[PDB]
Every structure is written in C-alpha cells, then in structure tokens.
Amino acid sequence: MKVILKQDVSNLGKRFDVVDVKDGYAIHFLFPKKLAAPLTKKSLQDRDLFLKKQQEHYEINKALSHKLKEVIEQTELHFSLKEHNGRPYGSIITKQIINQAHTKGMALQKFMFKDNVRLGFGDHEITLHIFEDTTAVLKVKVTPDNGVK
Amino acid sequence: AKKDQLTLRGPLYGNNRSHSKTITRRKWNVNLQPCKVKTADGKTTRILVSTRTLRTLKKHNRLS
Amino acid sequence: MAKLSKKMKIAVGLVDKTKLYPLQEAVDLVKKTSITKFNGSVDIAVSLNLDTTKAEQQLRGAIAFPHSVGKPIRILAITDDEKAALEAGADFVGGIDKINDIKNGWLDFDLIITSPKFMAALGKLGKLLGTKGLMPNPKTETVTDDVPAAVRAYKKGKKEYRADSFGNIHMSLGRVDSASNHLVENALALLDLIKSRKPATVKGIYIKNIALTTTMGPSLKVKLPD
RNA sequence: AAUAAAUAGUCAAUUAAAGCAAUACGUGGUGAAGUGAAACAUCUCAGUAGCCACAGGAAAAGAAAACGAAUGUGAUUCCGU
RNA sequence: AUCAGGACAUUAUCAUGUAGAGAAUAGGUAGGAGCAAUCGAUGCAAGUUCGCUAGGACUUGUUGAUGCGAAAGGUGGAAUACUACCCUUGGUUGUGUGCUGUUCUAAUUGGUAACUGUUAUCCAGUUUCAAGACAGUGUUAGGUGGGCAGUUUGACUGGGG
RNA sequence: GGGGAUGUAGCUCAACUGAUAGAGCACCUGAUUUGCACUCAGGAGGUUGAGGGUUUGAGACCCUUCAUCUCCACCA
Numbered sequence A: 001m002k003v004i005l006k007q008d009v010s011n012l013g014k015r016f017d018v019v020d021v022k023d024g025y026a027i028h029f030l031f032p033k034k035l036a037a038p039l040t041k042k043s044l045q046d047r048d049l050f051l052k053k054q055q056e057h058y059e060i061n062k063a064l065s066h067k068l069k070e071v072i073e074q075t076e077l078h079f080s081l082k083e084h085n086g087r088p089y090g091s092i093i094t095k096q097i098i099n100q101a102h103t104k105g106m107a108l109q110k111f112m113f114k115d116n117v118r119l120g121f122g123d124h125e126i127t128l129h130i131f132e133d134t135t136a137v138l139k140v141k142v143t144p145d146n147g148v149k
Numbered sequence B: 001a002k003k004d005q006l007t008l009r010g011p012l013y014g015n016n017r018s019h020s021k022t023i024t025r026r027k028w029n030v031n032l033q034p035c036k037v038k039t040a041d042g043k044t045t046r047i048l049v050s051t052r053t054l055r056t057l058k059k060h061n062r063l064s
Numbered sequence C: 001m002a003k004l005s006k007k008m009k010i011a012v013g014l015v016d017k018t019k020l021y022p023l024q025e026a027v028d029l030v031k032k033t034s035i036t037k038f039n040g041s042v043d044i045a046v047s048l049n050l051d052t053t054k055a056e057q058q059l060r061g062a063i064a065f066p067h068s069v070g071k072p073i074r075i076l077a078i079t080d081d082e083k084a085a086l087e088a089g090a091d092f093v094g095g096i097d098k099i100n101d102i103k104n105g106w107l108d109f110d111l112i113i114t115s116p117k118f119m120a121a122l123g124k125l126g127k128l129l130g131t132k133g134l135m136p137n138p139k140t141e142t143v144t145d146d147v148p149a150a151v152r153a154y155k156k157g158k159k160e161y162r163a164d165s166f167g168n169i170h171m172s173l174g175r176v177d178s179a180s181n182h183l184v185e186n187a188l189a190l191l192d193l194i195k196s197r198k199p200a201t202v203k204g205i206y207i208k209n210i211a212l213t214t215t216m217g218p219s220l221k222v223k224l225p226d
Numbered sequence D: 001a002a003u004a005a006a007u008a009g010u011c012a013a014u015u016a017a018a019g020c021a022a023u024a025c026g027u028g029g030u031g032a033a034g035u036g037a038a039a040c041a042u043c044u045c046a047g048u049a050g051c052c053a054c055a056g057g058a059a060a061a062g063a064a065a066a067c068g069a070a071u072g073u074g075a076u077u078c079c080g081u
Numbered sequence E: 001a002u003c004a005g006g007a008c009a010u011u012a013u014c015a016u017g018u019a020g021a022g023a024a025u026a027g028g029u030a031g032g033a034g035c036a037a038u039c040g041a042u043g044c045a046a047g048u049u050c051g052c053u054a055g056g057a058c059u060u061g062u063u064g065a066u067g068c069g070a071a072a073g074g075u076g077g078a079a080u081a082c083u084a085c086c087c088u089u090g091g092u093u094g095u096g097u098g099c100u101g102u103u104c105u106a107a108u109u110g111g112u113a114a115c116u117g118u119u120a121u122c123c124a125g126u127u128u129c130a131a132g133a134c135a136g137u138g139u140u141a142g143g144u145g146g147g148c149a150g151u152u153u154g155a156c157u158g159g160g161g
Numbered sequence F: 001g002g003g004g005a006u007g008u009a010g011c012u013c014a015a016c017u018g019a020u021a022g023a024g025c026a027c028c029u030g031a032u033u034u035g036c037a038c039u040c041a042g043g044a045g046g047u048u049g050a051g052g053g054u055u056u057g058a059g060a061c062c063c064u065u066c067a068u069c070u071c072c073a074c075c076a
C-alpha cells in the first residue's frame, strides 16, 4: 500500500516522496523508525494535500527558474564593450550593477540573487565565465561580449 | 482459555467427518496471537488477540 | 533483423499488427497495401487446429467461389470425350498421347482433369505430377465421369484447398483490382465452408488465426487473430 | 516503582454484586448411551438425559436486503388444516 | 529486510543451418519470380561466423558498379528472386515467480542474569543475554499409530469342533 | 473406467521422428597354445508387436487393436 516517507532513504523515495510498497517490511517496524508515516496525519487525502502543495510551490519555483535560465540561454543580450586600455589596465571590473543596468527591461529580469558570480566579475581584456543560477539545481553560463568602446 | 480479550468470540465445537462419514466431536480454536496496542503513548499491554482483530486494528491504525 | 525496404516501412506503418481488423476494412486495407506495379493476388492464410498427421483431420477439398479469382487457368482434359471437354472450355484435350507428352516433359498446363479409366497411366507419372501438385484427386472432384461439367466449374473459379503439414490453409481469393465486396464474399464462402468441414475429432477452437496478405504485402491479421 | 515524566502499584470514600428456591416453565454452552434398523458401522435414539451459565414473572422472537407467482400477502407469537 | 546463485517461462539481445541431386547451406513451408546500390559494389589482403566439413555470410578496408545466374539458367520429393512466415539452436542480460545459501533484526520466544511492584522461588513491568523470522500456536492436507474406542467373525450338521 | 509410455538379431538394447536397420552378448568360421581357457577379427543371426490411413517420402508420423508397465480413480 501507498506510504509516504518524511525523510530520505537510499531506495524507494527521497525526502518527501510516496512509495507503494506491500504491508511487508516494517509497518509496526516502520512506525517506530517513523521514517515513513502511512500518510500525513495518516489521512490519504490530507497527505495528498500537504505533499502536493509543498512540491507545487517547489515546481512553481521550477517554472520561474526555467524562465530565467532559458531567457538567458536564448537571449543573453548583455553587451558591454567597456573602454579597454590594452597595454594599460582594462577588464570587466564593472562589478555587476552596471552589468544589470542592461538586464531588466531590455531582457530577462535576471534576479539579483540568481547570478552567483564570484568577487571578480570578470578581470581580463577578454570574455570570462559568468555564473548565474536560477535555483540551486539549474546551472546557467553566460559569456557576453567585451571590447573597447 | 482460547478466547479474545477485546471481543469474546471463542471456539467452535463440531463434527470430524471422515470417509464413511463417521462422526467424532472436534473443536476449532481461534488463531490467538500476542500483540501490543499503544493507547495515548502508554500502557502497551501485551494482549492476545485473533488475526481478524489484528487486521481490524491494522486497518484502524491500531484503534481500540 | 534485416532492414525493411523503404516502401515496406510505409506499408508496415499503415498496419497495426495488434488491432483486430474487421474483414471489410482488412480487404480495403489489403488493396491499399499493394505496392506492386503488377496486379498482385489477395491471399488468405487460415491457421487451423488440425493435426494433419491424422487422416480424419486431413482437410482437403474444393470450393466454388461466387466470383472469379482473376487468374486464368490452363486446363488439360484427359477424357474419351475430347469434343465435349473442348466445348466445356478445356485448353488442352487428349488421351494416352497427352500422357506420353507429359512423360516427355510437356507441362504447359495448370490443372489436370481426367476420367477414372486413365489413373493407371497417370499413376506411373505420380513422381513428376505429384511433386508439382498436378495429380487429380477424387477429394477435389478432379476425378469424375462428367469431365465437361467439372471443367466448367474450374473455369467458373472452383479451386482446391488443402491443409499444409501445420494445419494451415493457403488460398488466393482474387486480384488487388477485384471489387472489395467480391473479395469479402469469397472470404466468407471459404470461412463458412471451413467451419462446415469440422472433423468430429477436433476439440476446442478450430480457427487459430486468419491472415490476409498480398503477394508483396504485410499480413493484415484478420479480426480476432492469434 | 524500576526511570525524568508517566503508568503499574498502594490507600481512602461512595455505589452494586454475591446466596437461596417452584422435584415447574425460558435462553445459551456442552452433550451421550441403553434401544431400533430383527447383526452393524450410515441412520435412529437425540440435540433427549445429564453438566454448566443467566434470568424473568413469563422468557424467547419480532417490523422484510420477506414470502412467493399473482391486477397477490404485508412484524413476531400460538391453534386447526 | 538485504545480498548471491542458478532454475523457470522468458522479456530485450543477433548470429546460427546441404538427404543425396541440383555449382547451390534448400533450416523448413507459404504469396509469388526480382530487387539493392556515396546510406554505395564486384576481385583481393585482415578478422570472425561454421560443419553437409562443404558451405554460409558478415566486417577490416581498398573500390566504385555492378547487376544478379538462387531475379531471369540449374536440378531437385522438396527452388530459386523478393513479400513471406515460421525459423534450428544458442547468445547476453533478462522478466516475475517460487528453490535451496548467507547476513541484519523489531515481530516473536526463553525453565540466563539484574532491578522494581515486594519482607514475594509465582506473576507483571523495565532491561541484559541467547535465539530469531526460525520457533510456537491456529486452519488445512498426507504418513505412522490395538495407545484407545465401536463392531463383525454364516448356516446345514444323527451334540459341538 | 481412463491417461501416458514401451514393444527392434535368439538375449540385452541403439531406435536410422521419411528421404531406404545398427552395437554388445548367444552361435559359425578363421587365427590362436604342449593342453585348457584367455585373446583378436570376419561371417551369420532383423520381415522392425500386428493391422489400417496419408504423402513422392513413416519400424520412424497417425488410427485401431494385442501384450507390458506406472499412475490415478475404484460407496452397485
């Protein structure tokens, strides 16, 4: 019968998941380890409600994350040919605020907490790695243009 | 005795029919088995219940 | 698996191997799956629950189709009444002389019809004609005193049926250009005749599978297959 | 108390139960054998005797997931056929 | 509960094949003689499939079209292509079952020890140890079972046996 | 009362699941020793349990029987 596990186990389910196993293995040996409650509040429908809502907020997060990531993978129209000296110093040290002055409005919003670039924000006369992550799972790479104005 | 403690259903006396339909009195005993029923997280008595009552408790989430 | 030809992938893509295709629909589909430039045959394979090792379960006979199968048959008549056989529409007539021609290797005919008197001469040729299937059989009404009427019946589209060693009957119902109703009526007449020809010894399901196919087509598992 | 809590346990107060008989009726559990079948094992005796539990002034049963074959009757109980 | 193994039908996986005859690998038996080619040949070298010990294809290429004589000759019980279908067999995991084989434990068990109720060999609770899905118990079904029970074991007969 | 299987040299057995019956033993002969036995090899010993049915092809596949066996059943 269907049983919900509240934390993660190696097989079956990962944290909040549902597995349809026989009465079998634990039951009175599952309750003590309370690793898989029969349902949430033991109610088939109530567990439905709870797990559904939780993973639903989770996948609406999934949706906004995908939006950000793909609008980036498809557009990435963030251009900065910032004047570069050459022999004298020249780099992408334009932090990111000037760089985000081209993200919202002209392109995807590209939330502030979503571009997890490091403290360098580019430091060469050449394009470097731009790290933007919509969530902790989606990995976004941006390599925008650079040059001398 | 061979009886439930939650309900009172007990043994059934009957006939032992064989070839030639010879009659000998026999007794069917209930499948008495030991179980522990929690009650408000306490008094986990080791009661002796039948398998049918065990199934009823199991489908009732151990409620009695 | 051998790579299917380009045309057949299309033709196989038109056929659900799992669906139970109703007769009429199968015939209309069978006509559509003909990929050939020549006028193919429409053929039926009926798998029976027969042990053809059992003489009582050996199914052999003839069926007269309501409609012509559209294959011209050259008939050799071996009879004393050569004139009436010719008027019946035999393509070749003769007595012992044609038996000698057959002995010398002349085989430009598709069916032999004969009178009972000639089996002793033809029996000596059983190795040549029997391996080719040209040997007349009483069970097929190819051995008869009225050779002209039988000749007319075969020209009208009478065909022999025989169970193979596996208990299958294979017959050609018509051409691809033949009207679909004619093929359906021909198929029904065969199936009803087969049903009517049940050996008393065959227990259970008699027809295991019915398959319609063309000369160059996939088999379109007739309704209620396998 | 084991053992923090809590139960088990201990104590106190209040309320009921015990038993009897009517050599008779009710319900339930358990339940033979003599005997007959001209033997006997199926069967009968007989769910009788006996044993036990619970009553009551009666008890039990009781308002159709029914009878049953029809333009049908419409809780249970008891008598005749 | 987990792990491993085969066993099973077998998911999924391709090879593999000669009565003779007929150059023919003919595994068979159906419709009936074609049908593929830069998705690329033929001839050869390098591997391998394989016993009919012949033959079979393939890939490792060259190569660039042939055809192809199993398209079309050919004999053969059986025949030619190609649509077939079934394949012979094994090939690997395999599917979901049971089958013996381990490990772990919470079920459960204890006539191990300890504490408590408790001034108490029982019982109950909590442990600890030892087992352990075994055992025990319930239902069902075989085997043995004068230990026990209910009965039978004829009539004629110069008495009966 | 069915269900299955078996029947092949005299004996013990392969069965040559149709493209035309073989092995050990029994027996004859030959070699073989001073003798016996042993030893080796040829030959002989087959109408495939019987009958019927099919095809071009069956002891071999099918039907019918015969004998044998193992199972079950086996309350007139």
Ligand SMILES: [Mg+2]
Pocket (backbone or CB within 6 Å): B023
């Ligand atoms: Mg009795």
Ligand SMILES: [Mg+2]
Pocket (backbone or CB within 6 Å): none
């Ligand atoms: Mg009696």
Ligand SMILES: [Mg+2]
Pocket (backbone or CB within 6 Å): D036, D037
């Ligand atoms: Mg009596």
Ligand SMILES: [Mg+2]
Pocket (backbone or CB within 6 Å): none
């Ligand atoms: Mg009352």
Ligand SMILES: [Mg+2]
Pocket (backbone or CB within 6 Å): E111
């Ligand atoms: Mg004791």
Ligand SMILES: [Mg+2]
Pocket (backbone or CB within 6 Å): none
């Ligand atoms: Mg057990």
Ligand SMILES: [Mg+2]
Pocket (backbone or CB within 6 Å): none
């Ligand atoms: Mg028993």
Ligand SMILES: [Mg+2]
Pocket (backbone or CB within 6 Å): E146
């Ligand atoms: Mg006895």
Ligand SMILES: [Mg+2]
Pocket (backbone or CB within 6 Å): none
């Ligand atoms: Mg006795």
Ligand SMILES: [Mg+2]
Pocket (backbone or CB within 6 Å): none
């Ligand atoms: Mg008696």
Ligand SMILES: [Mg+2]
Pocket (backbone or CB within 6 Å): none
């Ligand atoms: Mg007497």
Ligand SMILES: [Mg+2]
Pocket (backbone or CB within 6 Å): none
């Ligand atoms: Mg006397």
